[PDB]
């Protein structure tokens, strides 16, 4: 079996990517935050706090004849962000793009942080990182894709990111034409439960490539690019008036800049993200200082490949015995 979903920016800054997923029968269609970075499918519900819910299609595990309470079972998560939820978990059957897994864990979120409420426009998160980080308690649940490897034609998902635009993600294949050249695969470590990979360095703009081993995770659930401080210094050196901000919580550059590319390496593949790709606009309406989208990583203790970089590729979670992932140029 196959699946494809098209997956589609919330903002007009791409700070996040929502993707149609069918719960339950008859189909509740909920539109999930597809994340690498983690390992469960929480939804807002029926059984949501009723004051946290704020614009949220909702599943109602009441109206699904296929639900199942998983009796005993709980989970609770907090994320990278700070922002957190907790809840009970019903199996039930989850469809995406066309591929369905019957008895998927879909947990029913009792409980979300104020960064969820606000945030109309997403549903839910269904995590694609290694089951090993699933929350669910007393009995680890499997994510989707664990649950469909078996049954697809290949034991792959590939994620395509627009740029200000929507995108794909396909399970069980490897849509020839979405990308140029020719995919170039690295190494994972598994050990921390991430598509974790070591980049062979960067350039910023036309500047000479650094060689250096960049250990990071392929994570589509963070928007921005955060990678080592010395780096993230060297990127912003080349922006006329950039600055990092302590009050704002990052670098700033001013609005009136044209940012320049950066390029990471992935062996001896490049990956270029343009420019534009870097800028998440005014810090505040009106503001003449603009957002960067490279970041430093010290003190989140992990380097993170988020959607910025992502986004610049078309990108192959390879989900074999021994997993791997691939980049391509698009």
């Known amino acids: 079996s196959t699946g494809s979903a098209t997956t589609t920016p919330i903002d007009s800054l791409d700070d996040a ?19 690498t970075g983690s390992s469960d499918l929480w939804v807002f519900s029926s059984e949501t706090t009723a004051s946290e819910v704020d614009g949220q299609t909702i599943y109602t595990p009441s109206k699904s004849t296929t639900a199942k309470l998983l009796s005993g079972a709980t989970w609770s998560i907090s994320y990278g962000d700070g922002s957190s939820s907790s809840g009970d978990v019903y199996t039930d059957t989850v469809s995406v793009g066309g591929l369905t897994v019957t008895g998927q864990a879909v947990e029913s979120a009792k409980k979300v942080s ?10 839910g998160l269904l995590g694609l990182a290694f089951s090993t ?9 499997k994510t989707f894709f664990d649950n469909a490897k078996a049954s697809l034609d290949s034991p792959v998902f590939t994620a395509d990111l627009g740029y200000h635009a929507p995108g794909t993600y396909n399970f069980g294949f490897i849509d020839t034409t979405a990308y140029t050249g020719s995919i170039t695969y690295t190494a994972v470590s598994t050990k921390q439960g991430f598509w974790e990979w070591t980049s062979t360095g960067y350039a910023v703009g036309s500047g000479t490539f650094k ?15 955060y990678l080592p401080a010395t780096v ?38 490049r ?7 870097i800028d998440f606009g005014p810090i505040s309406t009106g503001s003449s200082s603009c957002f960067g989208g490279i970041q430093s ?28 992932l691939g980049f391509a140029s698009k």
């Open 17 to 35: 990517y929502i993707t149609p997923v069918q719960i339950g029968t008859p189909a509740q269609t909920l539109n999930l935050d597809f994340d």
């Open 114 to 123: 104020s960064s969820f409420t606000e945030d109309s426009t997403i549903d």
């Open 133 to 141: 980080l699933n929350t669910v308690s007393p009995t680890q649940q």
């Open 211 to 225: 060689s250096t081993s960049i250990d990071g995770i392929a994570d589509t659930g963070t928007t921005l690019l």
């Open 232 to 269: 993230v210094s060297a990127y912003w050196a080349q922006v006329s008036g950039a600055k990092s901000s302590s009050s704002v919580g990052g670098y700033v550059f001013p609005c009136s800049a044209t940012l320049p590319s950066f390029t990471f390496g992935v062996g001896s593949a």
């Open 271 to 277: 990956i270029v993200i343009p420019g534009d790709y």
């Open 297 to 324: 990583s010290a003190g989140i203790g992990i380097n993170i490949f988020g959607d910025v970089a992502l986004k610049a590729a078309f990108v192959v979670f390879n989900g074999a015995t021994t997993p791997t």
